[model samples]
Target: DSNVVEPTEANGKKSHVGPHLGSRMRIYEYSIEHNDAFWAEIARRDFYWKTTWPDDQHVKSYNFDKSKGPIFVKWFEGAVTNVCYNALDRHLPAHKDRVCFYFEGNDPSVTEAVTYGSMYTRVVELANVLKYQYGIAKGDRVGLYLPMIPFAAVAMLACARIGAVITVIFGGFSAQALSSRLKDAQTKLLITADASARGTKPIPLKDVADEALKECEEEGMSIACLVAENMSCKMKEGRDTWYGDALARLTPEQHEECPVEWMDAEDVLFLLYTSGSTGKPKAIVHTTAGYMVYASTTFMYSFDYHMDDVYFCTADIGWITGHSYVVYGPMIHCATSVLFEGVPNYPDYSRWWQLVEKYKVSILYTAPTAIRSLMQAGDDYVKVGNRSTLRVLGSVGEPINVEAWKWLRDVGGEGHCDVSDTWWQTETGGHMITPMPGCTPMKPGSATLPFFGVQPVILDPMKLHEKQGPAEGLLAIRAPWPGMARTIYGDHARFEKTYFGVDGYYMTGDGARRDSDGYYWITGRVDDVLNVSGHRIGTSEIEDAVNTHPAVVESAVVGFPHNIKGEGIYVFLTFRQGTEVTPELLAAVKATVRKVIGPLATPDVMQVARVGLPKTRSGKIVRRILRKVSAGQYTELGDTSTLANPDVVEDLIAEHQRLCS
Candidate 1:
């Protein structure tokens, strides 16, 4: 295709998985064709564990059932492993003095640092508080209602230390989101902070927790709370206790005495509540052994991470990227990882560049939204530092448009580093379809290839499999992988209906296409496809087309009710730094779409968005809110707290109402 570019030797190099381009293909093919042996061998050799499976007892028993009633899959059967032990404890002796996490805030003066030894002690002490102090045990749920603070990361590890199923609520979430999650998880205990400190304001976390606790109380259920005393706030008598005081009461032996719980492979590790299209929270459950193995292996291979590499992922610990890459993945391999307590452009627009220069960070993984937004401040923002120490640059959360990807490659990478566009989700635990920095080919708008053990099959409208062509279809996986989500917490029926609703495969709910050369291009969410007079059009494709215009920075396309067409395409987009919004610019935007995806994909409604599209604090664009707003349902914009700029939603809604009237 004329749209995509081929990988060049100058731009691409294979990583730890293989040496040459031809060989990398073989390894990927081998992993897919011999999926069981690939994982079993990796589990036996590459993965570090406290206990191993029996050599004589078939090593492992795995199966994926897609017959009649429901879809069932099992991995590492009859195996025992402790995710916490492999991640933290195993690396303690050798990397004791090495920095495990580099923590700092935008204020610069406010900071916290830790070594492997010190971090281990902190985790154990907190684990004791959760286990002995609160009588919490394996399978019990612990809620973390905190910010991008040190203890937020600590709280997760501490919960995993004692086999407790952890659920981290984004501190950006409001009282209602908090209460809803707390109720759904039937939370045994709540770990919170006195307050949350972001760019310029201190958010009142305790007040919101108090509100959520009341909601819990109203349900005839009492929730125990442990507050982290973040901003020196006074704690209530019986309702909550300070985290520091609770740990201080324990002796040195108490900190050193806790044992890692060796758990079954299929045991639940954590539950993350992700919102679906219908505006309901689903607690996605991930298991122990599979997640540990997947997270660590992907980290090691994806960035070609090693001992000397200092990896920084610009996502809060509340989100999945932070949970998998920053906390669990890096530690499991004993690699130095940066734990940022500030936003990318905080204090000044140069914070990210400053961090790279200060820490000499090698691998910088951030979302495309951050890249596009930061790049808008101009190239001078990145020109000051000799940021050659940066080795790998990555994009997550959503598919990056061509312009942003090119900008990231030019200004951020300086033509030396690899620009890896990774596509996966909260359910997959780690990257599924992405370019391995060293081994894969380069493509600006395409994710390029599938990860080892991932079997991607494109299913057509008639539910027919079309793997070998330049065709668009619903994305599905032929087999299961280690990091895949087991089920939705307490709702197996919903899980079955959502993912495996189609027989014989696990539907990913994404739309994609395969090129003649075998590269996978992700279009967008399947449900977000617009039916414009029976012509199928993808929202992502429209957004991508609009983004190619030099004046546009980002775009969000939604489907609105149409009298004749049934579903008319509506677009709201942001402009570049110096670009002014005008009628000519709008014409150019529509012209770009017509040229790229043809006339049927052109938007019926176009507007110069007064505010950027609403995105979660994790940098994920929430198009569901945009869809509702475009349809004139301003009141239906639910859970705006997770948005990066909650105020932007109102601005968009106001614009919607004004335009409609």
Candidate 2:
């Protein structure tokens, strides 16, 4: 199913280069040979640490080796740092008055920005309230179940400011998801807002948190404090404090009393949960110095981010993309980051482009899911705006189909932007296989190459070269680089089982093939492959085929029960918004799949429904549930509350009844 092919010609002809590279091959070779020196120099230049890493034994700075069992792999060992200091404090000297974030909600009362000076003040004030009034101490965990608001950013910065680990839950998540994550992390305080605005809807975030706490309180899972941003909605008098009231009460002297608790490089900075294509969610941990260094460096190299560049990464802080690009990555470089609390077609589809022209956003990073969503919204809404300011456009979260990638190039930025099909995961902490916008050649449907120090051992059931080129296998990393997740929170055994090999390799759970040009093309998830008549077929390959069809917006492929063939393909589709499903359209889609993946690959069941294809708030398709429905197990779609659109599962059940009845 891994059709490894040469890249098609991209729209923009010229490719740029970074200064360190004499040529692309030179820097890549140098990094492979002298990794320690390469990373050390990068660390020295970009990272700000209280105490530097060991001078001697720079070559052996990391503690782990493949020879050792799955032992602790510490990069930049013996360093002292604070993530908040690196993210905001260090940049203030040169960019004190510069805007740190441009914040906007979905057509709401509050929509403005915060300069570095304003953000610093708010972070310090919030930190003081947490430390003095709320009794938050170092090493204690904090929970931020928030939308894409300034308070969410404030919570993260404040928690990190005092060396507390933050776990940000996506605001759209249901009460049960919130309860489980809060219980798992055992947060000292849970900070949230009264409401979250999205499109024309106002989500009652406080109400949801309250419902979650109701269950927790009964189970005796006592969260030490709940600092409600308002706490006014049915406030539990003594247990909760309004964020504004508490922050206002804090004095400058109280703020001074709270100070940054310096941490060793291995001290945990944050815990982000990954539920990608898996039944169980795992909490991935990242350390301070390593995460800061890797995230900042990746930002510089991959995005070619300038200090003056206006960058917009359309991700909420709860997701890893948001944590890296929107908050931590851009902040470390003092780049202007845009925080939007709305969907692409909220006030209209023109919302995103409005931001681009308004801020002159040089870099726009988003997911392929959104690109297709807006593409289905039609080009008229997009054509109304002036997006001449966009320079670099990015695709994250999933494999970008060639059609959407081209639409983003031609329509999103008017054929004058670079489209980076960036690929990475929550475990890796930052982008792994991505183009150095300044160095690598652009490919329509490829991640291009591995970034510096990202030694990809893609076919590694064993060592490198054992799994030859032009073949697909489970993606793995032989070496542990800085920014790699330390462990699954409180479950090192599970972490080892899930991510690490017995020989100390990290498995990426995804599958991809290396082309003859060394460019990598990602095949969705390795487990996503279906065996049809003993032929293993990757789901994304079929999805790409369906997506390229003129009327299709997005599609998902899964295996259904078939008596003779053992397993049959089922394609759940959603077409261009206004296009009704017709017999001809259905036949055309089937023909398209047959043309791309051969006649045998045509789906036995072609489903046209958006509400039936469930997804999480972070835009990941919940195929596990869909698979159950495809197999006629509608009753087994367990815990649909976790889905962004919980009602979608019911729609799936009804559709299954209609199909099978």
Candidate 3:
């Protein structure tokens, strides 16, 4: 029997609930009993192997030594597989006529749909063009710098089909960011759009690409830029070529199929860069067979996806979510998906809902930040269109606060759908720990259960030892899965030191709390954890509580040195328009945090502001900038160029200084 107990109601009062409560205990018990059989069964269920493993009793262990690195265990060893064939070509046999992708833009004017067969043909044609015209061979690096468009999906699949490693740079990134990635990966070809339309405005994407290529060229890097016409934008001579022109010139005749390269299980498939707090971004490398198998399995089971479900992930092709879900995951299962190339509030806040109604999107996967933004806009924004079709809702990138989760579950999902709060890093390859919608019970603030084969352990912060009981600690994965990244590009030692060397486990960097019921609640990064007057408080917990207030739209909490207390909490808050930021509002914010977590965690300084928080292009909050600004160290904040609005940081810093003085 499991040690964790379920919450019970006594005398009409409810007991405190914990993360993943029942499901984690059950999975843990099952895992302890089954051990080798559990993983063997999961492997069998996940893959379509030509030759199965010798036996279920085979013991498996991962050795990170350099000598054993090249000899990493080949999962599904004898499997003869092509990811493109599995994701696209196989779908054509059955779901050929089914709508595979429904694309909508911020503008009401732009909308398009593609069937499974049509997507297959486009990908195959593009694959052939790359093979013959561009000379893009196996293992060659291709950079995709397009917006969230169907062709972006085609570009990714086409690269995968030809055994080329794709490095997808976020379109919103500046030329410098793009140059850094290009130089790191030595990308030979860049796929981009001439222009991108967001709401009523048009962004000159090709111009940015041209500038980035110039920077690359200055650094002695030569890359061919393939520009697709999103709008009529001027193209530079020799440096840029039209994707339409190049495709139009090629004969419509089908080229002979190129053989799928028999890649080892650890063969690198893509290089995904993570936005770092300091210096250059880390290049995370993912493999072919393992990443494909893990991603496909998680996409199928976690979302409770089937053949007919229409999947819609609003993330752009630049990020890992876009790579796994928008381009690979849904296609792998032959499920219909949607590609959205627009902002949430663009052309009004009703854009997302309208698209949902039009396409009847079954599973809606998006970030919590977007959900919070929509919630702040008002309930009317979500109620504008019919959302009876949504079955499963998903949260990615960051942890979803309870208020945001509840809003997404009630308002966006229309109360019936399950909200799957997924937690994983770019290096993890795909969703690591997430509640399987409907199949597993969920806790509002917790990510809930781990995916199959994920062994999670919570290590006590103070003791730096593995904790067994209900206590908050550092989050770590005790075991490596198929989707785990092999190494950082050109820095295996750095990878080992950062992840595996610290405690003989994969240090997740994030801190978490395992409740009495065995549920795991992520409490933000370990660096974000604060000790205020000897009381440990998670910044996310405080932020979540503050966000629950009616006036607050978003918030960021950081610890700053104080005269009386060793450290004091400083909260940067962004309020909704027309909501007066008076002394009463400040008191209410403090009261809310006190009510949710405890009074010890209340913000010592609450600076209400008009501007949005500083964030990366992909919408991740730059807490490091806020922490630095709060501490009155303005000049020390490194690399503000990547920020969505560098001016916001200046404004915030000015306000913080004025208020402190």
Candidate 4:
């Protein structure tokens, strides 16, 4: 029913901001006045509660002014709720028979669907087994290292139902990375699959888990059990347990419903680690009530879901997007969500489209990197299936460029569905800036507007102390939202110093500009901004422009120091397959950049490199490593060992050295 209504100018623009400056001023004033109320209304509208709290209880009044000692606030006080109950039990009475999850594999040969009742039954059965057999208790940390499968979702929900905090490590991460997380959390249990198919390779996940467990054992850490799914390999004695064996022993009869732990609204629910531009990863801790409230509410509003609408987010359970969108958000709203366990290009570039066709996925959400990569494969892969059932499309991870966004909208959505380019981070648990499909005005490259709870302020980087007018600045939230990370795990001071204490605002660590019309455009990470001859340029802006060239597939831009200019742009591009690399093509790319954002932003050096840029397991480009390599400081690339392809660094370094010579 919701799909029939097309989002038009009448429905899209909520602000009274007119073409003239006067209306813009009025809209700004209105936003400031009702910002708190707007968010309060959103929470009250979506959440299921025994009782409700007033707006004052949810929103903090004080701004982050360090001159006044310690700004503290409580959110959703005295509200009794369980996320598991909201996700599973609540939907059973009415929608028990409805399909909740449709899992499709990379090969396009295997598919599985789990109904709401079936999911609930599986979660309860697993929870009982975890309590009875494994001795897993409340407040214990459970390490989850698995691919995007139904069992991954089941394990997460089972943990949530019994108050076990889950730390999910991406399946593709190295043993050392996984071990670090297990040791940090002091986890006693781990859930992993035997193997996961990626592209054409079957990655041995259990092997990595065993190696990680050995390291944990050497460190004298507590790891009581390892639950292996899809068991294919021989298991070591006294350590590993088969998933099917554990579930088979448990009866289907309902166990005593575990008493919902009365946790503080700010109690940490999950620990998600993110790589800093410098140094080791920071473990961001998101809390129970706030995260659930915000993410669920955002999913409902941003996508405008109907009961029958099937939601599909092609992200692994390891990342925050998978945690929030793939598992938590959609389930909390009782929406049918799909999960996939392979790369978009696996079997072929048509894998995602084929899945969409089979599932008739109405609301499709994915990352921009995926879209750009699929765009590189051309429209032939997309034309293999019918995507007519798709009514809404969503973008995440990085900002979508105009060209890729247009291609995705035209080809993937069949030119009919509305695409929402969303902007948020792991620290911020839900959508911070997004255009709600069919509700907010669409922008080709911009994240359109802040969600109800978010109050984004573009602080002037030049004048750090003063809030200047629109254009260029460091992005900051004027206040904390419900979904804001509580603290860095075991490092409260680091959390304060990195996020809250910076310029006396909740620093987003991102550079952005609010256009005269109040639309927010995210220019890459703040650290990625290049100072070129006294002018600041965002690397993402240049990279996006370069990627628009028909011959280019994807690009990464970094700043290398120059003799004359403070910093000069060095671009690494990956061309489409069979495209001949030549100086003429390089000139055309520079010309494209010049046309897109003026001649001043043109790259000083453009090199067409091999495909597959070095990325973390979570799909973030290691631009810092690129910068270091480009500057001929290859030895300073702190941790190349953690990259998916460490050899890519050697290639980049050798190419840079050759170019310089």
TM-score of 2: 0.78
Best by TM-score, which number? 1
TM-scores of all predicted structures: 0.80, 0.78, 0.76, 0.77
- Which residue runs of candidate 2 sit more than 4 Å off their true CA positions? 1-22, 56-67, 224-232, 255-258, 276-279, 460-465, 502-504, 528-661
Go through the candidates in order and give each one's C-alpha lDDT.
0.78, 0.76, 0.74, 0.75
lDDT of 3 at 454: 80
Look at candidate 4 and tell me the lDDT of residue 625: 87
lDDT of 2 by residue, 29-88 (tens): 767778888888888878787888886236234424446655577778877888888877
- Candidate 3 residue spans exceeding 4 A from truth: 1-61, 64-74, 77-80, 255-259, 528-661
Across 1-661, the per-residue lDDT of candidate 3 in tens digits comes to 2422122122012101123445445655675466556656765665544345566665244664444343233344433456777777766567788888887765668888888888877787788768777889889999988888788888888888888999998776666557778889999999998778776667667777777798889989889888877655667777677877777756666432444554545567899886332334578888776788778777876677866577888887777888788878778877788778888778899888988898888889987667767877888888879999887888887666667787888788777677778888777878888877544566787877777778788987677678887878789887667677778888777787677644456788888988775668887666555645433346776787789988889998888876434467999999997886789879998988765544456789998766899988999888888878888888888788889877787788789888982
Query: Which candidate wins on lDDT?
Result: 1
| Residues forming the 10-long window of minimal summed lDDT in candidate 3 | 8-17
Error of 4 at 156 (Å): 1.1
Q: Flag regions of model 4 displaced more than 4 Å.
A: 1-41, 50-63, 71-73, 252-262, 466-469, 528-661
**Model 1: pairs clashing at backbone N, Cα or C within 3 Å:** 13-438, 14-438, 14-439
Q: Better model by lDDT, 3 or 4?
A: 4
